[PDB]
Amino acid sequence: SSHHHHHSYTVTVATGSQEHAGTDDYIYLSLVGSAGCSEKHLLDKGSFERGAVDSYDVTVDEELGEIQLVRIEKRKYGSNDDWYLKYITLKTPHGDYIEFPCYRWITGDVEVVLRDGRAKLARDDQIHILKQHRRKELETRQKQYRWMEWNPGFPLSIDAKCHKDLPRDIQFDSEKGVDFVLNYSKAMENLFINRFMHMFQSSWNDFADFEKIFVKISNTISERVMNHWQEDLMFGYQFLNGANPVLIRRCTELPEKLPVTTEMVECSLERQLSLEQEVQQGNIFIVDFELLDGIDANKTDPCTLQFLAAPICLLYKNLANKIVPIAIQLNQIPGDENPIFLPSDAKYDWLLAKIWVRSSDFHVHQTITHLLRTHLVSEVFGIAMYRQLPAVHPIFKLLVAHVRFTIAINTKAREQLICECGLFDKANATGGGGHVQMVQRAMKDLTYASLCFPEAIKARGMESKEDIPYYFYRDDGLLVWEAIRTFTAEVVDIYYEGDQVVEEDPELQDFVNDVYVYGMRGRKSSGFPKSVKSREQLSEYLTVVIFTASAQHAAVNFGQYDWASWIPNAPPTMRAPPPTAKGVVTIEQIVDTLPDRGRSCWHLGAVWALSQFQENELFLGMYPEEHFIEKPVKEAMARFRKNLEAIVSVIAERNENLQLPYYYLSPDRIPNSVAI
């Protein structure tokens, strides 16, 4: 893979490994020294092939001094062969070895100009050559990466209508590599379900009819779900360790809108305390779907009415310290057509009440927990990073690995999935616009504090491991949060000698300010910082960014097939309204309320496709793109990787004693960024 060209500097040029990384176009290189610039040098005609390392001897007509910049210019040979340049290194006549990180796609359209890889704040740059490069880099970034309002009240996102319109630097490696249209359909073939793809008016004949399809495609967890989804324990388990474990709260007072009494739930209580006494002891929990109240249901199929609820589910920590459901009201305002269902009800009344809660959990999961609170948030940070932090800045070098492919996957989603008449409308009862309404309503509670994982856990009253022992999302989340916090605090400490340097960093300030003003729409109640004035505040902010993009996304994304493939445990839609009376519903009715065959197919393809890892996925703390080249930061990265490996072992030992292992937050399964 290594080609040495001999006719002085030795210039090493490293081409990417991605499929189309290579180029046959003319490549010119110049060196900018403090004492002068070199000539433009055509690097020996030929092809920089995928994965290539080419070395060239380059003799200069004059002494240049310390090399400050390297300039690359791609000129056309034949047609446009985009080029992925990983890095350039220099061995100088004076014997020094200088690395210039790039990690960028180079189209013929503009010269690329690189600093050496030592990280620099603006205050480090005092000579004109460097100040001009830095300022021009930011001017160009701010023309190429612009903010846009895709839907009213949303966090602002990238100003591009489709993926092909993005700057090449932030596109996927290919145009059809990661594609919702192609991958959802590919999923339905691999899952063997393609004959039913568009059968949107046909119910399953019974549970057995769907089981026949499911058993061929189940995995370990989803097979357990199929066998156990009717159990109260399995239903309650998911609020702590399922796909959406972020909603449950410790109840400190029973809400007036839920007129439940001790007599109603006395059979569930196990301590000879009244319900009001259980509340006060900390044994009562609540999941409250107020956000779904008044969301429009999908009306895009006139032959299929679809329906949403907005339930309140009351839960109890029993004598085994397991949290189990004790009461379910399917809508927000109580009354005689909004019954409080109970585990003492007729079998299928209580089962259906639980299905409605699971369906509601799925809706909030897809649109709020996952899309808004990890995808759109991560994209806000990535756009702000590109607009305001030059590539030589240490926070750019730190964060660029954690926003990889984020704008690309979100733009594909707005292009194909969640746009009007996109794929999301096919199976989901919030399709057709209710999902946009939910985002608008959740925005008003997307706060900074809600992204600070320890505080957010405490805000829900769920922090006590002694009182609430089987919350593995919490336990693993806290360890990973602290690992990132430790890593970011060290990086900050290397490059920022004190708080005044943080406060005076104009690019950092503009980064934070773009997130507040554009990303968060300038809402004071968001609690986002308008500026950052200390090293500790910066460390916490960078942890919010990285944790949201890696750990939080992984926890809520990669258990989607596990928990939602068995459709009764997570219906994407319901084809009858919630039951208004006890003693009526039958199992046959439930079958006809659950998704039709077509919606089931699209749902399974979607949760399968979205739960996949890539063959060379980058997991947390894997940084093959060496933006950082300096020894102190590389030692910080090594300590990060060691802290993470210790967490892997903690989780592995914990999981061996568990009925259902919880592994979404094992760091060896957490990708660096939102990329799917």
Residues 6 or more apart whose CB falls under 8 angstroms from that of 48 comprise 13, 15, 22, 23, 27, 54, 83
Q: For 276, which DSSP code?
A: H
Q: For 271, which DSSP code?
A: S
Measured over the CA atoms of residue 656, residue 657, residue 659 and residue 661, the dihedral's sign is negative
CB of 371 to Fe ion, least distance (A): 8
Per DSSP, the residues of 298-364 read --S-TTS-------EEEEEE-TTS-EEEEEEESSSS-BTTB-EE-TTS-HHHHHHHHHHHHHHHHHH
Which residue lies nearer to Fe ion by CB, 106 or 674? Answer: 674
Which residue lies nearer to Fe ion by CB, 23 or 374? Answer: 374
CB of 553 to Fe ion, least distance (A): 6
Which residue lies nearer to Fe ion by CB, 232 or 562? Answer: 562
Which residue lies nearer to Fe ion by CB, 557 or 673? Answer: 557
Q: Both tokens of residue 551?
A: 């750990």
CB of 55 to Fe ion, least distance (A): 41
CB of 378 to Fe ion, least distance (A): 9
Strands 284-288 and 340-341: unpaired
CB of 556 to Fe ion, least distance (A): 8
Distance, C-alpha 622 to centroid of its chain: 17
Residue with nearest beta carbon to Fe ion = 557
- Angstrom CA distances, 599 to 309, 425, 569, stand at 19, 10, 15
CB of 372 to Fe ion, least distance (A): 11
Q: Are 158 and 148 in contact (CB under 8 A)?
A: yes
Which residue lies nearer to Fe ion by CB, 338 or 557? Answer: 557
CB of 375 to Fe ion, least distance (A): 6
Per DSSP, the residues of 39-104 read --EE--SS-B-TT-EEEEEE--SS---SEEEEEEEEE-SSS---EEEEEEEEE-TTS-EEEEEEEE
CB of 560 to Fe ion, least distance (A): 9
Helix boundaries (H) for 365-433: 377-388, 394-399, 406-412, 424-427
Q: For 490, which DSSP code?
A: H
Which residue lies nearer to Fe ion by CB, 378 or 573? Answer: 378
Which residue lies nearer to Fe ion by CB, 365 or 474? Answer: 365
Q: For 216, which DSSP code?
A: T
Q: Which residue in the block uniquely carries the two structure tokens 């954690």?
A: 402
Catalog residues that contact Fe ion under the rule CB under 5 A: 557
Which residue lies nearer to Fe ion by CB, 543 or 557? Answer: 557
Distance CA 173, CA 18 (A): 7
CB of 377 to Fe ion, least distance (A): 12
Which residue lies nearer to Fe ion by CB, 366 or 593? Answer: 366
